[PDB]
Structure formats: structure tokens, C-alpha cells
């Protein structure tokens, strides 16, 4: 038997960091950048009008202290270069390329337009209302740094410098497998002796909430040679494997036999309840973490929350997402085994009058009305109503 601390240490040390991958920038949202992205071109690539108005030389409208003919019009997306002569105006739309030898846009709201000529109601200075070439990004500027989490603004910057893919640290890939001769999938109608595969669905979901890239394999059935094939197929594309039904009830000896041929499998129990019966191993040449969980679905959720989720947070290399722990008053009695850390699925609430936290310990209710876990220390053997306890809050 190992303590929760020893087992937590072993699995955490074994976490595999996924290799960086180059992916479409749209799919990088929330992932950490694995490269420095430098601008190579100027942004904007040309001086452009910031507003609707008239491109002019500032000096022609009093800008260095009479109407000007309006000799042309430029819309956004115009691709042909234009050349302004002295004492002329060209009507420009927001975003259009500014005519060459112009230096300012006189706003439409500041102009008195005839059918040929325009009169400035006030001067503009050189550069006014012009987005100059390179004003937004210059060549050599760091658009995105290695290590930055790619949010909406960073994805915009990647698009602004013309990047369609970016090198990122991906989420760790996890494969979820159920073994058991009695298991049927939830679309079937089970007969005598048969059980719906609960664990592949609930544990695939827990892995997604944990931040993993999850493939739910589902039920793995067959002789151990065939189970070895299935498991081997999952090792090729996984940083984490979760197998339920590999420890506990009989019939699973053959599975533990093939796992021992793929890696070194450890089935020492953890001093905790529920979930003392479990296993852990490292599979293949790349030492992929492989968790052996039991068929009991509540115990599996507890083992997954206590040991698998930390490894997903560790492989991810982002934050720890460590669960908040509040102190709450116990509403009912709970017993626990001396020497085992207890993890009791419970309902955490706020007292109707005092702002205090209350916790009500809870299979149907444990899997339903629960949002927290009372964490019972190894030494504590009894909780009476009114006791104040540690509650892991399940966000």
C-alpha cells in the first residue's frame, strides 16, 4: 500500500510533454505558442486614408500657416497607384491607398463640396488621418512570443502578419478504454449478465474537462492478443491511456498479462477510499503513462480526479488548475477508515443566513447532486454533523 502522496508523485514524474506541432491559427485558440513570430512586411503596406474625405497636401488647405478642384476618387481596394498634383484634391474612402505626393486627408465633415471643387472649413496638418506605411507593424517586430497563450488578440496578430499556421504546444492526447466481457454499449438493450459501459463515457468527459485531447475508444473485447493490438494502436497516438476493468474483478488477468508485455505494470494499492484498488504502468519505448482503473464508476471518477487530472495538467504545461478547497460545516455523519485518505462526493452549499459553507456527504446521488468532495485525512476516522472539514470544490 502506498499513500496518496507517493502515488501522486510517481504518476506526476511520469508525465509526457507533447511535442510541438504546426497547426491552423484558428485551431490554436487557448494553446501556448512554441515559437517567436516576427513580422517581415510593413503593416499597413501603403499609406491609407483613415476616413472618408479628400487627400490633399496639408499646405494646400492652410496646414503650414480658396477651393481645390476634385480631380479623382479612390475606393478601398484600389490597386492602381495615383499621383496628386499641387493644389488639387482627390476624394478618398476609408482604407483606400492615399494618392502619391498627398500627405493628409481632409475629413468629409470638414469640407464644403461643390460639384467639382472642395473648400476646407479648417486646415489639417501633414499626416493627419493618414495611416502611414508600417504604422501598425514594422518588419522585425515580435507579433507573438514563444510561451504566450494564444487568445483572440494574438490570433489576430498572427493573421495580420500573414501566418496561416503556428507552432504550438498541443494538448496531451488521451485514449479511454473499457475492458470487461459483460460490457455492452449504451445503444444496445442489455440482457442477463450485461452492463452498460459507463466508464468510457464519463471518463472521456472528465479528460476533456481536464484539458486533454480525448479519443474514447470504448469497449475493448477479445482474447488478450487482440486486446494487445487495440492497446498498441492507442499507444501510437497517446500521451495518456486510461483503462477501466484492468484491476479488480477476475477475467482481467489476461489484460494485465499483455500490459506487462508492453511495459512494467504496478498494482500496489493506494491508502485511500474509495479507489484503493488501482494500477499504474509505463507502456512502450516512450514510457506512456497508463492508468488501470476499476469498474466501479464512482471509484473511477475519484481516481481520475486525484491522479489522472494532475497528469493532464502536467503534460499540458499550462496552469495547474488546482481545485479550490473551502472549509464547510458537515450536515451529516461520515465514517472513514483509519489510515486511508477519504474522498467523499458531496454537495457544497452556502448557508441561507450566515455566509458560511455547508457540506452534505453523499451512488445515484453521488453521481448526481454532488459538486464537491470532502477530503478526509488519514488520521480522521469520524465526521459528526457540525464538524468543519476540507471540501475539494469541483468547478
Amino acid at each position: 500500500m502506498r499513500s496518496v502522496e507517493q502515488q501522486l508523485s510517481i504518476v506526476t514524474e511520469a508525465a509526457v510533454a507533447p511535442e510541438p506541432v504546426r497547426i491552423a491559427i484558428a485551431e490554436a485558440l487557448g494553446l501556448m505558442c512554441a515559437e517567436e513570430v516576427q513580422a517581415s512586411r510593413a503593416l499597413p503596406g501603403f499609406a491609407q486614408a483613415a476616413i472618408d474625405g479628400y487627400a490633399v497636401r496639408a499646405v494646400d488647405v492652410g496646414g503650414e500657416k480658396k477651393s481645390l478642384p476634385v480631380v479623382g476618387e479612390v475606393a478601398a481596394g484600389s490597386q492602381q497607384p495615383l499621383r496628386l498634383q499641387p493644389k488639387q484634391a482627390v476624394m478618398v474612402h476609408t482604407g483606400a491607398p492615399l494618392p502619391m505626393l498627398a500627405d493628409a486627408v481632409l475629413p468629409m465633415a470638414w469640407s464644403d463640396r461643390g460639384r467639382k471643387r472642395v473648400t476646407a472649413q479648417r486646415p489639417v496638418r501633414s499626416g493627419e488621418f493618414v495611416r502611414k506605411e508600417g504604422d501598425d507593424i514594422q518588419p522585425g517586430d515580435i507579433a507573438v512570443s514563444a510561451g504566450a497563450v494564444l487568445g483572440p488578440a494574438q490570433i489576430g496578430l498572427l493573421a495580420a502578419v500573414g501566418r496561416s499556421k503556428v507552432l504550438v504546444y498541443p494538448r496531451p492526447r488521451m485514449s479511454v478504454i473499457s475492458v470487461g466481457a459483460e460490457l455492452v454499449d449504451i445503444d444496445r438493450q442489455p440482457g442477463l449478465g450485461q452492463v452498460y459501459d459507463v466508464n468510457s463515457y464519463s471518463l472521456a468527459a472528465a479528460g476533456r474537462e481536464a484539458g486533454a485531447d480525448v479519443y474514447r475508444y470504448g469497449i475493448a473485447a477479445g482474447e488478450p492478443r487482440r486486446i494487445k493490438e487495440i492497446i498498441e494502436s492507442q499507444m501510437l497516438r497517446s500521451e495518456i491511456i486510461v483503462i477501466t476493468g484492468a484491476v479488480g474483478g477476475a477475467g482481467s488477468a489476461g489484460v494485465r498479462q499483455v500490459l506487462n508485455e508492453l511495459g512494467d505494470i504496478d498494482t500496489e494499492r493506494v491508502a485511500m477510499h474509495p479507489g484503493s484498488v488501482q494500477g499504474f504502468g509505463l507502456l512502450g519505448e516512450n514510457k506512456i503513462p497508463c492508468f488501470l482503473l476499476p469498474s466501479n464508476p464512482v471509484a473511477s471518477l475519484v481516481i481520475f480526479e486525484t491522479f489522472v487530472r494532475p497528469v493532464v495538467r502536467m503534460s499540458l504545461g499550462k496552469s495547474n488548475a488546482a481545485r479550490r478547497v473551502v472549509r464547510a460545516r458537515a450536515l451529516n455523519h461520515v465514517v472513514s477508515v483509519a489510515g486511508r485518505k477519504g474522498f467523499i462526493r458531496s454537495r457544497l452549499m452556502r448557508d441561507a443566513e450566515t455566509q458560511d459553507y455547508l457540506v452534505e456527504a453523499l451512488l445515484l446521488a453521488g453521481l448526481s447532486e454532488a459538486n464537491g468532495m470532502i477530503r478526509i485525512p488519514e488520521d480522521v476516522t469520524e465526521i459528526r454533523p457540525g464538524d468543519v472539514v476540507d471540501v475539494i470544490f469541483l468547478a
Binding site: 454537495r347 457544497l348 452549499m349 452556502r350 448557508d351 441561507a352 459538486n371 470544490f393
Partner: peptide
Amino acid sequence: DLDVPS
């Protein structure tokens, strides 16, 4: 600070 029932 925490969203919980009453």
C-alpha cells in the same frame, strides 16, 4: 466567492 446552492 463561490457559486454554490443554498
